């Protein structure tokens, strides 16, 4: 079952476009009747672009949780298939159901993507790309992480990364590190979930989002800006009504350096304590 053939995918529509790769719905239809199941394939639009297509289909492959989205196959490398959410993503379903999610169930989500992290930190996985948009909605009371788009494993006898270039994604989820030095880590992985933290408390309301409130927060470029605003230890503020033991944990985990951050096998106790 992990080898679809192209000609029984029915394209539906756009989920969404990376760097140089699409998402897309379609039907896994070999019957053509329209009653096969909906899956989500990702495909690149590079010699060195799908040297990195194949590293992410064989990261996701091996990679078995409740709180990871699940790989389904491969077309061929050509398409990457997984299993399709219908919720869709963390960010948008917390807009959408704001006014019936309490304090608890954010901290059931915040648990569980703390187990998969820890998860992904057991297989040596750096994520990169920690964000509400990336966390799919399972069901009401079940989250997962996606989008292993930037993932990298990191070799036995060293526990970070350097990019020669500096990253495209949004600036506001970057550790400070990543932001002065291209380094990335299970630590900087840490920072980004202390953010993710920010955005479950804020239920992803546009008007308080990292961009809104880093660049109102904020000749020199932001990047540069962003750098010093947290060198001078500011930080995003206590979402409204966020409880005190919640903004603690984020604080911890925007702690300076890499070292001080808490890890994912620390937060997790503290997190599932707070939800009980
Ligand atoms: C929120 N609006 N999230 C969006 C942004 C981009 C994107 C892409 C794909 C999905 C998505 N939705 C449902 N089911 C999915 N299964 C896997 C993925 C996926 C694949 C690659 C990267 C991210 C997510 C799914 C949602 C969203």
């Not at 057991?122 to 994520?127: D, E, I, K, M, N």
């Not at 500096?166 to 990543?178: C, D, L, N, R, V």
């Not at 880590?185 to 804020?202: A, C, K, P």
């Not at 927060?217 to 800006?225: C, E, Q, T």
Request: charged content about 25%; some cysteine; glycine content about 6%.
């Amino acid at each position: 079952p992990t080898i679809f053939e192209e000609r029984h995918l029915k394209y539906i529509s756009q989920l969404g476009k990376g760097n140089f790769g699409s998402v897309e719905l379609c039907r896994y239809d070999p019957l053509g009747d329209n009653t096969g199941a909906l899956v989500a394939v990702k495909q690149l639009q590079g010699p060195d672009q799908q040297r990195d297509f194949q590293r992410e289909i064989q990261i996701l492959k091996a990679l078995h949780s409740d709180f990871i989205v699940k790989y389904r196959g491969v077309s061929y490398s050509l398409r990457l298939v997984m299993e399709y959410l219908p919720s869709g993503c963390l960010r948008d379903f917390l807009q959408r159901h704001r006014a019936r999610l309490d304090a608890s169930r954010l901290l059931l989500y915040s648990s569980q993507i703390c187990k998969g992290m820890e998860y992904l930190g057991s297989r040596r996985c750096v994520h990169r790309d920690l964000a509400a948009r990336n966390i799919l909605v399972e069901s009401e009371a079940h989250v997962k992480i996606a989008d292993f788009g930037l993932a990298k494993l990191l070799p036995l006898d060293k526990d970070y990364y350097v990019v020669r270039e500096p990253g495209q994604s949004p600036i506001f989820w970057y550790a400070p590190e990543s932001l002065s030095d291209n380094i990335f880590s299970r630590q900087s992985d840490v920072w980004s979930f202390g953010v993710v933290l920010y955005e479950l408390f804020t239920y992803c309301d546009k008007s308080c989002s990292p961009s809104a409130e880093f660049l109102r927060m904020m000749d020199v470029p932001a990047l540069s800006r962003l750098l010093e605003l947290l060198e001078e230890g500011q930080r995003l503020p206590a979402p409204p009504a966020c409880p005190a033991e919640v903004h603690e944990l984020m604080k911890l985990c925007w702690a300076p350096s890499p070292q001080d951050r808490p890890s994912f096998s620390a937060l997790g106790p503290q997190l599932d304590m707070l939800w009980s």
